[PDB]
Paper text:
Bro1 domains are elongated, banana-shaped domains that were first identified in the yeast ESCRT pathway protein, Bro1p. Humans express three Bro1 domain-containing proteins: ALIX, BROX, and HD-PTP, which function in association with the ESCRT pathway to help mediate intraluminal vesicle formation at multivesicular bodies, the abscission stage of cytokinesis, and/or enveloped virus budding. Human Bro1 domains share the ability to bind the CHMP4 subset of ESCRT-III proteins, associate with the HIV-1 NCGag protein, and stimulate the budding of viral Gag proteins. BROX comprises a single Bro1 domain and has a C-terminal “CAAX” farnesylation site (where C is cysteine, A an aliphatic amino acid, and X any amino acid).
The construct used in our studies spanned BROX residues 1–401, and therefore lacked 10 C-terminal residues (402–411), including the farnesylated Cys408 residue. BROX crystallized in space group C2 with three molecules in the asymmetric unit. The structure of the selenomethionylated protein was solved at 2.7 Å resolution using the MAD method, and the final structure was refined against a 2.5 Å resolution data set collected from crystals of the native protein. The electron-density map was generally well defined, including for most side chains, except for a lack of density for the loop spanning residues 379–390, and marginal density for the terminal residues 391–401. The three BROX molecules in the asymmetric unit form a triangle in which the exposed hydrophobic Surface 1 from one molecule packs against the hydrophobic Surface 2 of a neighbor. BROX forms a single curved domain of overall dimensions: 90×37×38 Å. As expected, the structure resembles the Bro1 domains of ALIX and Bro1p, with a core comprising three tetratricopeptide repeat (TPR)-like helical hairpins that pack in a right-handed solenoid (helices α4–9). The TPR core is flanked on the wider side by a two-stranded hairpin (β1, β2) and a helical bundle (α1–3). As in other Bro1 domains, an extended loop traverses the length of the domain on the concave surface (BROX residues 332–365). The convex face of BROX does indeed have strongly basic character, as predicted by this model.
Residue numbers in the entry:
A (entry chain B): -1 to 374, 391 to 398
B (entry chain C): 2 to 377, 390 to 397
C (entry chain A): -3 to 378, 390 to 401
Amino acid sequence: FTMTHWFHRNPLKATAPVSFNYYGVVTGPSASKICNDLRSSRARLLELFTDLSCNPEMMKNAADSYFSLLQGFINSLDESTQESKLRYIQNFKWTDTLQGQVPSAQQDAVFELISMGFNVALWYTKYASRLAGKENITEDEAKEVHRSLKIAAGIFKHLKESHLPKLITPAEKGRDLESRLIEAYVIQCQAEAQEVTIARAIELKHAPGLIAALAYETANFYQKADHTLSSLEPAYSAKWRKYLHLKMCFYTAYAYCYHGETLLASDKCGEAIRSLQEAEKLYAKAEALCKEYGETKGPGPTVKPSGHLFFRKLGNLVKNTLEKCQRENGFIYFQKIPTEAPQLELKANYGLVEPIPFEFPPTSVQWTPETLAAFDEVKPVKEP
Amino acid sequence: THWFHRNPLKATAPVSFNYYGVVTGPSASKICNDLRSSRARLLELFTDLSCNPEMMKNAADSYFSLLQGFINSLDESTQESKLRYIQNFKWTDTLQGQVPSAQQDAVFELISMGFNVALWYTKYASRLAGKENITEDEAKEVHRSLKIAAGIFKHLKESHLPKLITPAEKGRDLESRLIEAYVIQCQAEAQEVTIARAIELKHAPGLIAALAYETANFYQKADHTLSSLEPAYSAKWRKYLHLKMCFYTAYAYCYHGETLLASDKCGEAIRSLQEAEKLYAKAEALCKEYGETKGPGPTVKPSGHLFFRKLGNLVKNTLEKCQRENGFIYFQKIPTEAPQLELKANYGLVEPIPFEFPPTSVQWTPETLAAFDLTKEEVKPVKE
Amino acid sequence: DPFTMTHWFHRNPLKATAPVSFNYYGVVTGPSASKICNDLRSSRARLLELFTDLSCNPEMMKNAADSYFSLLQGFINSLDESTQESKLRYIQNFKWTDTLQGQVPSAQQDAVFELISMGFNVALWYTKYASRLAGKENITEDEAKEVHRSLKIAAGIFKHLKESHLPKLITPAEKGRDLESRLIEAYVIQCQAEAQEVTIARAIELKHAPGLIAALAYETANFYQKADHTLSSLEPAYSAKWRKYLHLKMCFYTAYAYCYHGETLLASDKCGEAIRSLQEAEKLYAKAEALCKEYGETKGPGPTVKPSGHLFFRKLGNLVKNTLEKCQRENGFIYFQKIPTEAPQLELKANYGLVEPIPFEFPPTSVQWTPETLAAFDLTKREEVKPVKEPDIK
């Protein structure tokens, strides 16, 4: 019915156009075909990243077209020879999410594949956040938000697992093509996916125990993401870590809050009060982090967190639940309020999200030992 | 509001109770007078729209009270009354159209008349359940009428059928299997009223599922009991019992789905509701067939009946809920096979209200009986 | 808070006392010693006028009480942390009326008699503040909390008086007067019960389990039964009306118990048993109505507002009717169970919501008392009761 989320998004990656022309070395009509298609499908894919018309199907479709043609430069047709003789033919320049307009370059097709794939995953996360903000979002759309976030995680995960080790020149800290940076995108994608799950479990009036456990695990996801970026230099990674940190605090708050409900239901009203008192602490901390995030410099979203409805819903919830617990303890239970916060040992039995497995398409049919034999400036991106 | 199929009332040839040479005094004469009048008023009421249960009972008691003088001995010694075989009684049958059957046995009149009385209660009930304007007290009356009818039928089959000298041929009302079917049907139909109420009163889905499951068993048990009869005159009736059986199994799967969902078995819940969907569709197929099937038939047809729409609606919404739940929270697989329904209804199972015939009329004395000297017919069709 | 604070509490009249000057001609010398006598004097006077001051807060009351009591401690407690008791305990005679004894005063030349009599009046005031504040049509939540708290404070003071001070008296009060064990006991129990009534009304409102509500109601009823029996020795002349209230509230809350117990039976799918339970409730409700009527006919000091017809009693009446109507519709439509002839014997015990008194202690001796100032009380050297009028009391 309604979705209230606030997602921080780093900028898209931008690349210098590639003609794919090598007039001298490319011989024959079909050898020209793949060079023309490589150019047009890459161009059409780069266009779709900013095309507001694009839906997941279209995106998967355009990525597959390009990727299937690109793998000719990387994978063997033989199903034997190590790698394509074309791997180091071209040079690809990409900006990176945390590095402003300062480009990195490699004459490695894998570098292109990973950088592009990274951008595709990134697009899915932006598609999700835009859609989650649609004014009269339908349930089938909210379901697609969840699914896009899981698709992004799987792509990120695949890149890191089975493509990043192939790179001849390792990427420096702060760069997108680095294990610690990708790992954090996987975790983040999972955690953002669980936010949607948590919202519904609350709208669908589920048991407070399940919600608290979901919220706790989500906070742990955000926490792990923050810790994974600890290595990076504050100059370019601080704004993003702030976000991850406030989400951790935010969902630890939801956890103490809903666990408080669980305690109340167990006639332990005094314990419930203490739980909720801890939640209002964490809510306050999350609000302080929202201000800091605003003050902190780095690439960022146009809508600031501090004062967002997302955070106001938690504040009201914590307030009501606390007051309800004090009301019950004042007139009925009369239990003592423990001095220390409860120890949250919560396991989410249902709702935990796993990335959606990602694979690149097969090498394009166009590639023939014959077609293979025939082989002898950044343009920035605009985001509303 | 319920839809109940109704077989035609039984019609009988009027009997004067005039035995000219046999009856002597004014007391014995008064008895025959009252027999003739009592029997007339009772048959009149069968089609009298203003007849309520109280008028029926009083009219039934009056006639049955007198009629038993032809059957029971007063001696507390003798086996039976000498008058048992003086009168010939001609009755039509619910399933045999206008083809009458006659026996010169007062017990045959007792059972044939009693049968009709029970049948009337079922018709009173179905009429009352036809309104949308029904009082709670009107709901009770519907329920009670069915239970009373059930009891009458049962008593007839148990304590009176065995008395007949020549047993009725298969396909006729006075055959045991046919009466047993009516007993079972009255129970099933009363259960429908109970199910409706328990739903209105927001009872647990487990109880509601169990009830629906039992009423389905009743209907199936009623159908199977009619399996021996010839299709020609029994087909339409069996279609109603089959569609009702399918209809309530659908109700059982629907509410059992709620039970599964409350137990965090969302996949199983969905499969259960998909079964309800199948069975709901099958009930509607049997519903079109009902109208197609030539046989002793009622005024209103079922397809589109609001009562039929409410289930389809409930199944739709409940499946949507389970699908929504599974799409946002549970993410469980949907089993291949529908669940086995093995439910126990701990409360609400209907039992017939025991019926006995009233004591032999006080008018019957040895003196009046002695005044009978034994030494010395067009069936009037019922239009309802 | 939506209509849940409607209650009816019987109240006996406040105690009245003869004014005390704290004037000791030859005995007192100097600024320090004469000041304390002025501070005692003004302090006592101020506290007494607050009792019938509708403006009075528990906060104001607590302040006025501490001020006077800390000063009075000097007539009772030693400064030594050694010597038995103050040399001043027997200088002043104190004159007081009793709640059940009209205007016939009783007096003692003992500062402990004054400490308890005044302390008694303070607890009494806290019960009257609560019942009064509970009559407010638009009561806020904090105010309903105040009613509950005040009753528990009163309970604590009464309990402290009976346990820590009553035994100190030299001459024992007679049967029928306030400084007597049984009478104070009844007040401890009654304040507890009345406090529980509030928790009950709120448990109902917050939709707590019927099993809990039934238990509290039952405990509450037993409190009233205990309080009534605690007064069973007193002479009917003066105790009768008060006891009718107690007996009434006992039947009333036994009815509440059977009612909500019926709800828990119904939810256990024992509809037939539920019906019997509720039938028992309507019998007790009716009996309570008789006691209400009988209450008016019974002679004694009492509240102006009368019990019979009060929304507080109709509230339960409707509840029994509606709950019974629900049980019989369920039985007529679904359950078809038999109704046991005997009413179930309740052996309910509340897991939560039982009220304990808030423990009371008098303030420590005023810092104003010093050996120097006590020294200035030189024992070597050498009254009518001001009646109290309250609007709430007829």
